[PDB]
Symmetry: C2
Subunit: 96 residues, 2 copies
């Protein structure tokens, strides 16, 4: 699965506000380049990064409208100059 | 959310075998016509349909290759001849040969 196919999924998640929550699990892990990862979280606000034993979990958010943000979390690890994505999660949340 | 957008998401799930599981929750519910629904499950094998008090849960599967299948389940309810989808789940499952 190339980053381009992932971008097609992201278009659907971002562009349809009725998607309250979506969870994606990959097996094998999806491989993307350093640039694609920075492109992936382009214009997002980095929230938390947790260096786990086996993988890193990072959270980001994009403002959508009003006080509603699209939150994004992924588990991944780094090897031989590539990012291996275990899973992705998006949820629309209202900030207090 | 238009049926084309839903169809766009399915094309990705179908064409990328690395997608082991996908869970989608809608709020508000996504409304599709009965024709769109049948088009959605065009070549799938119906596996189960459960009519509960508040919504229907229907499950389908498509054979992919060998003993590997793509399972699809959704919760929906019917009003004025239209289908309101609450949630969808997809998962790739291996149906193993069993019992000695």
């Amino acid at each position: 699965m190339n980053y381009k196919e992932l971008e097609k999924m992201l278009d659907v998640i971002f562009e349809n506000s009725e998607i309250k929550e979506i969870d994606l699990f990959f097996d094998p892990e999806v491989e993307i380049s350093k640039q694609e990862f920075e492109d992936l979280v382009k214009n997002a606000d980095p929230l938390q990064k947790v260096v786990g034993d086996n993988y890193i979990t990072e959270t980001f958010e994009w403002w959508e409208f009003e006080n509603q943000y699209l939150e994004f979390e992924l588990d991944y690890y780094v090897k031989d100059e590539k990012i291996f994505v275990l899973e992705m999660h998006f949820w629309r949340k209202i900030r207090k």
